[PDB]
Short mmCIF file of C-alpha atoms (C1' of nucleotides) and ligand atoms in Angstrom, two decimals:
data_model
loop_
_atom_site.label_atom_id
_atom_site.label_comp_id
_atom_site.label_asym_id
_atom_site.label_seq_id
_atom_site.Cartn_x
_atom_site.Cartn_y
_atom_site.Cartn_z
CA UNK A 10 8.29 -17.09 -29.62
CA UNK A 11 7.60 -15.67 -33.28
CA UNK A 12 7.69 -11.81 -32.35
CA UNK A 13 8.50 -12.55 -28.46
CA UNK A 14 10.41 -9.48 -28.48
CA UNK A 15 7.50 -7.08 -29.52
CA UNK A 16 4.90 -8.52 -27.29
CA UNK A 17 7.48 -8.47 -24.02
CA UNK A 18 8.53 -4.94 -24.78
CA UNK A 19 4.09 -3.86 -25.05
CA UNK A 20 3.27 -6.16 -22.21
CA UNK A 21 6.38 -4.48 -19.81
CA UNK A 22 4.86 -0.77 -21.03
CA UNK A 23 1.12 -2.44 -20.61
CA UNK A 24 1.75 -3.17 -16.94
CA UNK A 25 3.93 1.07 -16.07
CA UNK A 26 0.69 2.07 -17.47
CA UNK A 27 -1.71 0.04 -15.14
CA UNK A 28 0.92 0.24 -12.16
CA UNK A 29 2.73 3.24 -12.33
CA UNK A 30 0.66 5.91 -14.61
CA UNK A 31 -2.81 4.64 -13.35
CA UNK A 32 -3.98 4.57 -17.32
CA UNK A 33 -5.82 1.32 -17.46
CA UNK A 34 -7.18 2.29 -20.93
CA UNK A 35 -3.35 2.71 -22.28
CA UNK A 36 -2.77 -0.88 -20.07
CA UNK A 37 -5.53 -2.09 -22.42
CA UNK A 38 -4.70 -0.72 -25.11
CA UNK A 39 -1.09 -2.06 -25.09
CA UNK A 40 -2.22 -6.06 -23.90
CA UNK A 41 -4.82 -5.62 -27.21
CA UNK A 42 -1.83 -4.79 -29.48
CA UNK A 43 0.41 -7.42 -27.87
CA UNK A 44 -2.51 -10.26 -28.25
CA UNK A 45 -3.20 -9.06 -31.84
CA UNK A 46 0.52 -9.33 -32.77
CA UNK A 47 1.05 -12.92 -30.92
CA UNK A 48 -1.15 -14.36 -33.06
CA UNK A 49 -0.32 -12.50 -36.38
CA UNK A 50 1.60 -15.99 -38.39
CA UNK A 51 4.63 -13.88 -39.56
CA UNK A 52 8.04 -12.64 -38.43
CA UNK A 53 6.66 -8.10 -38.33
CA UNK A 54 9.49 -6.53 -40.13
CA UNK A 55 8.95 -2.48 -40.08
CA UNK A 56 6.08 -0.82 -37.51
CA UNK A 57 4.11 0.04 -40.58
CA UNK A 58 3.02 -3.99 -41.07
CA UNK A 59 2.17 -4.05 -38.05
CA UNK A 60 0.19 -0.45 -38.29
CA UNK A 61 -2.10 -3.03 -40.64
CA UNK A 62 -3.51 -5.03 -37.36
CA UNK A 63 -6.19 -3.89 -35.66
CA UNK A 64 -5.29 -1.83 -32.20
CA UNK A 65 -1.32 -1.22 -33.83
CA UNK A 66 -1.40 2.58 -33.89
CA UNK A 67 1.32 5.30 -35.33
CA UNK A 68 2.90 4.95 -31.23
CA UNK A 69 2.99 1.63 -30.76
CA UNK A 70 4.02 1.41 -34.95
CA UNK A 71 6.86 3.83 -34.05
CA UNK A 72 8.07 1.63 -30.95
CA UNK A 73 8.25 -1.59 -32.94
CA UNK A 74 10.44 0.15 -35.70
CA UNK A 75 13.04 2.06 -32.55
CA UNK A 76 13.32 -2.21 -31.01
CA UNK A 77 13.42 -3.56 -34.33
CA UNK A 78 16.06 -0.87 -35.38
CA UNK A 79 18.17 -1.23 -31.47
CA UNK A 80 16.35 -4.59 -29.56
CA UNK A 81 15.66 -1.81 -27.22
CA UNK A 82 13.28 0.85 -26.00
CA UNK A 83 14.32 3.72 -24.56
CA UNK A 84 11.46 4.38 -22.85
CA UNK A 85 11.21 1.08 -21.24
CA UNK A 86 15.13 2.00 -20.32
CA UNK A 87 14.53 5.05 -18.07
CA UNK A 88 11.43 2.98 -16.56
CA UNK A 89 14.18 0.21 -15.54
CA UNK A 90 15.91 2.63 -14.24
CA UNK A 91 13.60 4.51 -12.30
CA UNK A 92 13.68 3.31 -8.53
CA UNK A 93 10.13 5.11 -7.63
CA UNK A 94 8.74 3.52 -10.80
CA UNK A 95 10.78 -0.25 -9.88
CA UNK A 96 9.41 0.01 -6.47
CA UNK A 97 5.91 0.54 -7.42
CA UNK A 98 5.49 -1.75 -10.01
CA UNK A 99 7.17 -4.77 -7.34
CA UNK A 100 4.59 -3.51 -4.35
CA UNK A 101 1.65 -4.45 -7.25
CA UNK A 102 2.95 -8.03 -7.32
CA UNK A 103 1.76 -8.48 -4.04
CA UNK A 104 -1.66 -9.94 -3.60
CA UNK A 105 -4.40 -7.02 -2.42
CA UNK A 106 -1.81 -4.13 -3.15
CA UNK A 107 -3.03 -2.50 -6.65
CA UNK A 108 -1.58 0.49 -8.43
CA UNK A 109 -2.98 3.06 -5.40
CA UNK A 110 -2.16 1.63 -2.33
CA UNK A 111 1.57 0.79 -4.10
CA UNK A 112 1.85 4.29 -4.55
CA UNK A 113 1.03 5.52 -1.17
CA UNK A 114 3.25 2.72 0.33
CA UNK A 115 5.94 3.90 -2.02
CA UNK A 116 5.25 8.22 -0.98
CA UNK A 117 5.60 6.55 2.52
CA UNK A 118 8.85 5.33 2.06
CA UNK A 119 7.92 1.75 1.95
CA UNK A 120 9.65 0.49 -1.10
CA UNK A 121 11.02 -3.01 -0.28
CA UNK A 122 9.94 -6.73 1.28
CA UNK A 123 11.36 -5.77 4.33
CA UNK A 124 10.17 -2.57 4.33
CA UNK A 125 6.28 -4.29 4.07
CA UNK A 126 7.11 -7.08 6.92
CA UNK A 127 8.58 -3.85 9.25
CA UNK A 128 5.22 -1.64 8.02
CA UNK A 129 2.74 -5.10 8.88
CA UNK A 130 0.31 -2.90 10.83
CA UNK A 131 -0.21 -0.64 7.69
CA UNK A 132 -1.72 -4.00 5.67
CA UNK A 133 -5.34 -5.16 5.26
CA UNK A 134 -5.71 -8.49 6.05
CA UNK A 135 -5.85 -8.96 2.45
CA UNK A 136 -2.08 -7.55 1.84
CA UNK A 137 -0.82 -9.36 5.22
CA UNK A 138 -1.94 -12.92 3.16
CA UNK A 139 -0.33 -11.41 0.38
CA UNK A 140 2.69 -10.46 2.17
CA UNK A 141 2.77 -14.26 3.76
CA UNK A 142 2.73 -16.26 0.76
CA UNK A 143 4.76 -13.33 -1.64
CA UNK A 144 6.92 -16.38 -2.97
CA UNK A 145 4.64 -18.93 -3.26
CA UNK A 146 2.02 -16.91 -5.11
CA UNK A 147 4.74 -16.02 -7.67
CA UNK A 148 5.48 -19.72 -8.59
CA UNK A 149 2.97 -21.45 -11.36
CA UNK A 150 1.85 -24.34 -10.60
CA UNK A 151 2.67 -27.68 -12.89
CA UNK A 152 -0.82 -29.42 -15.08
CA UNK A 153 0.22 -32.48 -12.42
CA UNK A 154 -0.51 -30.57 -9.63
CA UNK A 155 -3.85 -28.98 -11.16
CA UNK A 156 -4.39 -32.64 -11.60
CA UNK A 157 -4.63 -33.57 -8.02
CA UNK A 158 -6.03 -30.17 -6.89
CA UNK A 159 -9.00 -30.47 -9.17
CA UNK A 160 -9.40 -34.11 -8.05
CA UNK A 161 -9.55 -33.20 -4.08
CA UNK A 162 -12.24 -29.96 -4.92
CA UNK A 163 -14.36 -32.57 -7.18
CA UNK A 164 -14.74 -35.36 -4.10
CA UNK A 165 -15.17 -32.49 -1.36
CA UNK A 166 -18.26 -31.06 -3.37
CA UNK A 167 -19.51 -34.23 -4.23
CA UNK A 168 -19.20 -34.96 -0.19
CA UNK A 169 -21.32 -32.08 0.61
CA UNK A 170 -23.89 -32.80 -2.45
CA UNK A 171 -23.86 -35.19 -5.37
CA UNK A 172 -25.94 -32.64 -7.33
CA UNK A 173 -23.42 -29.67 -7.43
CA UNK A 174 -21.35 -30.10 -10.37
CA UNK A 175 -17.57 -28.22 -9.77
CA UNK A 176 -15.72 -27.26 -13.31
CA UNK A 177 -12.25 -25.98 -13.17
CA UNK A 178 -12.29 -22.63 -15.48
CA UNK A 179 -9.15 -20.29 -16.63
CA UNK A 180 -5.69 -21.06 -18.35
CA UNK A 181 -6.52 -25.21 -16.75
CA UNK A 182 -9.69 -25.06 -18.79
CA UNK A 183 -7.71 -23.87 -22.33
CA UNK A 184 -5.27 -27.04 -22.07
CA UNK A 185 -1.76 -24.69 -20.47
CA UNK A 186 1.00 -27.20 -19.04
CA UNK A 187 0.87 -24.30 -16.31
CA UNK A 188 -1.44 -22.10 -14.42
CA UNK A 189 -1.15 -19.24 -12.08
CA UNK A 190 -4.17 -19.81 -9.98
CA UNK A 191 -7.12 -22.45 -9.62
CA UNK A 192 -10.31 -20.81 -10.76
CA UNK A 193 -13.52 -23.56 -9.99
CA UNK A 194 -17.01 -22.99 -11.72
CA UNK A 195 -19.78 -23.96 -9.14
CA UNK A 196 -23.68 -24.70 -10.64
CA UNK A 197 -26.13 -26.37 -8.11
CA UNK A 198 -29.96 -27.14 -9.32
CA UNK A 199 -31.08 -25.11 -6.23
CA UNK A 200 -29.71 -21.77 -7.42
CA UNK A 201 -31.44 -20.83 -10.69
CA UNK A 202 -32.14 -17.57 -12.53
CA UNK A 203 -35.30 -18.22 -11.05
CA UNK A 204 -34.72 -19.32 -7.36
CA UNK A 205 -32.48 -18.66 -4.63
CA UNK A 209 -25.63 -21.37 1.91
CA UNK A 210 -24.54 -22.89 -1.18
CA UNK A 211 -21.12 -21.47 -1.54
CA UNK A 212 -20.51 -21.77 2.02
CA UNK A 213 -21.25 -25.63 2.44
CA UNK A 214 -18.56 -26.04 -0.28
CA UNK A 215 -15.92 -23.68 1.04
CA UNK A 216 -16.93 -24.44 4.40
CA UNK A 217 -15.96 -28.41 3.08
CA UNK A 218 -12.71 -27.44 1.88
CA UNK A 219 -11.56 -25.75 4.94
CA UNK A 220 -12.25 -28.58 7.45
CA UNK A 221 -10.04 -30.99 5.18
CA UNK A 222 -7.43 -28.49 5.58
CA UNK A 223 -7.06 -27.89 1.64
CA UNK A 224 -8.34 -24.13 1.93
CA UNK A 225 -5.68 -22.72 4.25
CA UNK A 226 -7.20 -18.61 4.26
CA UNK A 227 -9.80 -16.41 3.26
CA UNK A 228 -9.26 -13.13 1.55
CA UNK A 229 -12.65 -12.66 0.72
CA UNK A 230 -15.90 -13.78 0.49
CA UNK A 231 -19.57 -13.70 -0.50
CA UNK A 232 -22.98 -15.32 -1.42
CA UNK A 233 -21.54 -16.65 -4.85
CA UNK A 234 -17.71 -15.04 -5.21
CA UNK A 235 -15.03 -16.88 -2.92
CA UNK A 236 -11.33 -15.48 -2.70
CA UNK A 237 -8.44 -17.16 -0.86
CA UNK A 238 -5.65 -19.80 -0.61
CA UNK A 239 -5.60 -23.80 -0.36
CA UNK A 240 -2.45 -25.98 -0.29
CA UNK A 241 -1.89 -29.73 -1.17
CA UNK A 242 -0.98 -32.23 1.37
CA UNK A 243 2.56 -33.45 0.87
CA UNK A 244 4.62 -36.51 2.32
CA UNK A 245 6.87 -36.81 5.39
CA UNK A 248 9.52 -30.26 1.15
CA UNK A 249 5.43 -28.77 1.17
CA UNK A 250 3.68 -28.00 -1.99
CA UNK A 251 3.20 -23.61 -2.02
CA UNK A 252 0.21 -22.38 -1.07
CA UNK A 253 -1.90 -21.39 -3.85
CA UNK A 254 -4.44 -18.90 -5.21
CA UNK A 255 -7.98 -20.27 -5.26
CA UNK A 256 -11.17 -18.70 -6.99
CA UNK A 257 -14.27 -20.13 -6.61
CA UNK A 258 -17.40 -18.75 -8.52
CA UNK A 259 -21.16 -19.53 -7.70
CA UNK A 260 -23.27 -19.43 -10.97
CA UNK A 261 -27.12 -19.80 -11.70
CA UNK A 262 -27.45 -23.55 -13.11
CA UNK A 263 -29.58 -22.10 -16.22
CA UNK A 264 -26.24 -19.68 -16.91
CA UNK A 265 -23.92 -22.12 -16.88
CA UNK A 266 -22.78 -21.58 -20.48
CA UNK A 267 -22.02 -17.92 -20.10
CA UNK A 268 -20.64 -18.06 -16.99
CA UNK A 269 -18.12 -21.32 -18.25
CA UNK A 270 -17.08 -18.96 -21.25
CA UNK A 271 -16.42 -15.85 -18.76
CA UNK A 272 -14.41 -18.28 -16.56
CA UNK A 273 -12.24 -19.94 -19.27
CA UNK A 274 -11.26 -16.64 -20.46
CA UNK A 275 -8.02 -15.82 -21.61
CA UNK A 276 -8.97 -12.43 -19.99
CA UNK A 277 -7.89 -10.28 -22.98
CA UNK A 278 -10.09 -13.14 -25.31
CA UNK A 279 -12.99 -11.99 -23.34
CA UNK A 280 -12.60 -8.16 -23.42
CA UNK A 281 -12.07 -8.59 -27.50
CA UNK A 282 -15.45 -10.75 -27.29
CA UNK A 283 -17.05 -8.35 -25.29
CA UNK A 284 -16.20 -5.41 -27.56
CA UNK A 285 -17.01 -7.10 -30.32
CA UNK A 286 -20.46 -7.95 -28.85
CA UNK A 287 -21.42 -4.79 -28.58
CA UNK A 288 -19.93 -3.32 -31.71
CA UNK A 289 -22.60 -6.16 -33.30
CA UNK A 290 -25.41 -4.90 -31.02
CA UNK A 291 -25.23 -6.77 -27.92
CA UNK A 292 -24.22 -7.24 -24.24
CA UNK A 293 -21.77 -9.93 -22.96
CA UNK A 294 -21.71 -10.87 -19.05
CA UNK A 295 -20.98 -13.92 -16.94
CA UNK A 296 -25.15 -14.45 -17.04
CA UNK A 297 -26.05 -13.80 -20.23
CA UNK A 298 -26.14 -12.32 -23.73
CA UNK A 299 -28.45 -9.38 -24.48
CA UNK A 300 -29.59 -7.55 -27.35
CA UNK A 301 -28.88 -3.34 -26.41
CA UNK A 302 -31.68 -0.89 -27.21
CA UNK A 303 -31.79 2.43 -28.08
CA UNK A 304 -32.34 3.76 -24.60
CA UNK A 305 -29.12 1.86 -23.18
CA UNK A 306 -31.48 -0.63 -21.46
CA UNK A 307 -30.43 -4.33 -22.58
CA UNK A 308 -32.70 -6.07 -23.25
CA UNK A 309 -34.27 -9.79 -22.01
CA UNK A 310 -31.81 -12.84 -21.50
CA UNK A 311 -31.30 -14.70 -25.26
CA UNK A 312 -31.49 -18.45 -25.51
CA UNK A 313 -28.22 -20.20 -24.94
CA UNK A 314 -27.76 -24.39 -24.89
CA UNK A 315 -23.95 -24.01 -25.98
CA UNK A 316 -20.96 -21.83 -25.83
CA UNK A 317 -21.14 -21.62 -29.13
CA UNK A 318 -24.69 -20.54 -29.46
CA UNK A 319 -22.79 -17.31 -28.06
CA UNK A 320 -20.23 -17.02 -30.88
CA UNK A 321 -23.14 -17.23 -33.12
CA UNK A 322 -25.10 -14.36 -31.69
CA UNK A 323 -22.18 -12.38 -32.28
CA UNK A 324 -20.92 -14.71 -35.69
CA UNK A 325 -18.03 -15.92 -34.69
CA UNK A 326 -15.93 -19.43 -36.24
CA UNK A 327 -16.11 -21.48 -32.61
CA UNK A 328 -12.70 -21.38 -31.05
CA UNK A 329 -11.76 -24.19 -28.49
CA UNK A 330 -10.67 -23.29 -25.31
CA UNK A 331 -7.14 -24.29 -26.39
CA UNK A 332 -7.43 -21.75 -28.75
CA UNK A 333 -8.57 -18.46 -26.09
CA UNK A 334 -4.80 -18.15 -24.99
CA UNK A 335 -2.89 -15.23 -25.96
"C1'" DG B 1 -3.01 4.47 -27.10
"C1'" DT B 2 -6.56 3.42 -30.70
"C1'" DC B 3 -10.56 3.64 -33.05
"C1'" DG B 4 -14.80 5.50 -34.42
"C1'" DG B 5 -19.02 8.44 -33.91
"C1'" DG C 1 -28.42 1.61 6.83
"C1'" DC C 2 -28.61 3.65 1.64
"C1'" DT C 3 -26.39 5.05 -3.12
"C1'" DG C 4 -22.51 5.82 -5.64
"C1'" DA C 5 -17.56 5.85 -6.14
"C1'" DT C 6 -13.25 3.62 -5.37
"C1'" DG C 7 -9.98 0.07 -4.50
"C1'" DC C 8 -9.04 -4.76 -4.68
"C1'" DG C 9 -9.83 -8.43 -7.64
"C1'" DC C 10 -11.78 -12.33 -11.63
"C1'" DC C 11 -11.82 -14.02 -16.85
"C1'" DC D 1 -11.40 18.34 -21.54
"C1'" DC D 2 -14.12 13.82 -28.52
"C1'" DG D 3 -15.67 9.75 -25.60
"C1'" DA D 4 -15.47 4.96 -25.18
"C1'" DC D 5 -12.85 1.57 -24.10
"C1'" DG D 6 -16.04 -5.48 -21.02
"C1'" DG D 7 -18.52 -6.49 -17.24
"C1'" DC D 8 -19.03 -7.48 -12.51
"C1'" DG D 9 -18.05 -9.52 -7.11
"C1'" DC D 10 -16.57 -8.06 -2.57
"C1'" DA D 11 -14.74 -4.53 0.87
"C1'" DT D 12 -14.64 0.11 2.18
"C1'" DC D 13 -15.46 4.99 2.32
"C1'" DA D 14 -18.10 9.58 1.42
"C1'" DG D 15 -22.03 11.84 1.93
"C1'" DC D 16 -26.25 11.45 3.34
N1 DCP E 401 -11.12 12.39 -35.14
C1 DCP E 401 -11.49 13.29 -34.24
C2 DCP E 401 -10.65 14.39 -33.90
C3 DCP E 401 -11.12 15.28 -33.02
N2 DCP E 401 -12.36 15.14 -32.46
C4 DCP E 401 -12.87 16.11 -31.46
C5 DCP E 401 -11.82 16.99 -30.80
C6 DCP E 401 -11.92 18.30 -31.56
O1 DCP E 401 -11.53 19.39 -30.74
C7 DCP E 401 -13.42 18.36 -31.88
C8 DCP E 401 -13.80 19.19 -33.08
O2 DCP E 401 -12.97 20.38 -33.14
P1 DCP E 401 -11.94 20.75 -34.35
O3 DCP E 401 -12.01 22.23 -34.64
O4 DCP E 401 -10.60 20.13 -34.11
O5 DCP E 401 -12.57 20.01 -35.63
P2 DCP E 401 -12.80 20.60 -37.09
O6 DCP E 401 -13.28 19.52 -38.02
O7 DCP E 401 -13.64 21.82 -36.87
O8 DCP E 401 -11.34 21.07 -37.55
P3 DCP E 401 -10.75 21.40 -39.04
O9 DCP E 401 -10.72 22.92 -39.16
O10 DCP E 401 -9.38 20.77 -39.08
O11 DCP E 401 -11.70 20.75 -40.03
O12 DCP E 401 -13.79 16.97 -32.10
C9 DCP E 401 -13.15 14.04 -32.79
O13 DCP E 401 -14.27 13.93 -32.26
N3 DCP E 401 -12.70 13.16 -33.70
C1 QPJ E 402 4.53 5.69 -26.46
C2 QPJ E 402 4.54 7.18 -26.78
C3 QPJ E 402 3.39 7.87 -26.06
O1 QPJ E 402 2.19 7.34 -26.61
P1 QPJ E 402 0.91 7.48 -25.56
O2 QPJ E 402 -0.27 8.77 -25.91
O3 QPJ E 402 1.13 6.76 -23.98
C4 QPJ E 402 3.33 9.39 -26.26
O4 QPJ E 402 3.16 9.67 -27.65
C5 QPJ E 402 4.54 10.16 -25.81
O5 QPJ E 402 4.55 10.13 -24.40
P2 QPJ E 402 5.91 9.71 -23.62
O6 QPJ E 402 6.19 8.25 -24.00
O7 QPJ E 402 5.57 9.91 -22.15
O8 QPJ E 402 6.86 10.74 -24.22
MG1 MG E 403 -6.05 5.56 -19.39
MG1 MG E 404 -4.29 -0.45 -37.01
MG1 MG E 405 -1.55 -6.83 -6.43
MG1 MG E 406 0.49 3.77 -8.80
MG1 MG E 407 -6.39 -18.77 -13.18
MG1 MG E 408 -27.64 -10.33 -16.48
#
DNA sequence: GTCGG
DNA sequence: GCTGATGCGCC
DNA sequence: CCGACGGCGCATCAGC
């Protein structure tokens, strides 16, 4: 809301970079300003205030003062405008298309949603799921219906074995009224740090209840696909589902990874290791002078890992952008 | 694109 | 098959 | 052509 304008205008020339350029570091660079801005408590009147906050730089300084001056960019006009650039960016949207394979669809001459359903035998099986639910996956899905999602994954693992414990992760886990995806947290006592089917019981569970509907891919603790609620006698969409296997003694790292926001855990990260450490989804590390972290650090809290790295806990409410 | 070694 | 790099993706 | 930039799972491909 307060300085919607500025972070719209760096998140639209975040996502040409990733998509159209292939500069993921400018893409960063861009989502860092944008996040650093959102939560900056005052109206930014003149690029050179916001030049003050950390990752604000002369460029993006001298953008802020052309849309404060117009409440446009020009650059961001002749992107609009662009139908090579419009078409690339849209093929991205689709599910197992990224910034390459967009392009070489787009060199092709395949540019379009009908172009893509009349091109079907150039997909992946990935991109043909993709392709299938294009609508659906574009739609959020309502707190209500997280609700009842979470609440069919929670008895199906329980089915399969009281002792797995199932936490859903991401924007759900931070409190948002909305989420794009379902991301669940899996931790069973049998899968340790220390000790090695236990992803494929559970997903194996959810399929023969009909809530996961396909599979885009999957491994020994990563699953990637779509589920679907069960509606009455107009269906629900289908739905992105994430499900990550993590060793029971890691939980804490691996709850903080999967709550995110994703930009929150970049800044962590580099903030880590500015402070002399190493950040994963397993542990923290200390680094050492040879670039060889060093041995797992004692953890009974998420915010035994702010500490490490002396940072005021933040609730997950309070990860968002 | 920005920051820092 | 491997390693290493790329392409897709997850926060 | 200053280099780093967060860290990693899964699928595939290049060159063995
Ligand atoms: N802040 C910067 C700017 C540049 N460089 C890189 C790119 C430069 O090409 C190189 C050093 O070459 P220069 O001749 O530009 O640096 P000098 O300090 O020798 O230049 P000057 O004569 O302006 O002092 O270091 C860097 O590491 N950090
Ligand atoms: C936003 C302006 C650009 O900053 P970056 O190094 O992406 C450049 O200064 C000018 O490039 P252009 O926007 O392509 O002219
Ligand atoms: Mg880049
Ligand atoms: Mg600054
Ligand atoms: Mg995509
Ligand atoms: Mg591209
Ligand atoms: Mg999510
Ligand atoms: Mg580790």
């Amino acid at each position: 809301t307060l300085n919607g304008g500025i972070t719209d205008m760096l998140t639209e020339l975040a996502n040409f970079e990733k998509n159209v350029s292939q500069a993921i570091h400018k893409y960063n660079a861009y989502r860092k300003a944008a996040s650093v801005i959102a939560k900056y408590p005052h109206k930014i009147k003149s690029g050179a205030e916001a030049k003050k906050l950390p990752g604000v730089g002369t460029k993006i300084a001298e953008k802020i003062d052309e849309f404060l001056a117009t409440g446009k960019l020009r650059k961001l006009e002749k992107i609009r405008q662009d139908d090579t650039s419009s078409s690339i960016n849209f093929l991205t949207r689709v599910s197992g298309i990224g910034p390459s394979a967009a392009r070489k669809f787009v060199d092709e001459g395949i540019k379009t949603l009908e172009d893509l359903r009349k091109n079907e035998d150039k997909l992946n099986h990935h991109q043909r799921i993709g392709l299938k639910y294009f609508g659906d996956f574009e739609k959020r899905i309502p707190r209500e219906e997280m609700l009842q999602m979470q609440d069919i994954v929670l008895n199906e693992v329980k089915k399969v074995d009281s002792e797995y414990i199932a936490t859903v992760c991401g924007s759900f886990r931070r409190g948002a009224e909305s989420s794009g995806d379902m991301d669940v947290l899996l931790t069973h006592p049998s899968f340790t740090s220390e000790s090695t089917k236990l992803l494929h019981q559970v997903v194996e569970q959810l399929q023969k209840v009909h809530f996961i509907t396909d599979t885009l891919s999957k491994g020994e603790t990563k699953f990637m696909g779509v589920c679907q609620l069960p509606s009455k006698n107009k269906e629900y969409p289908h739905r992105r589902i994430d499900i990550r296997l993590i060793p029971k003694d890691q939980y804490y790292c691996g709850v903080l990874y999967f709550t995110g926001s994703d930009i929150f855990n970049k800044n962590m990260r580099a903030h880590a290791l500015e402070k002399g450490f190493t950040i994963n989804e397993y542990t923290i590390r200390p680094l050492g002078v040879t670039g060889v972290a060093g041995e797992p650090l004692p953890v009974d809290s998420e915010k035994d890992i702010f500490d490490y790295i002396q940072w005021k806990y933040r609730e997950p409410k309070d990860r968002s952008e």
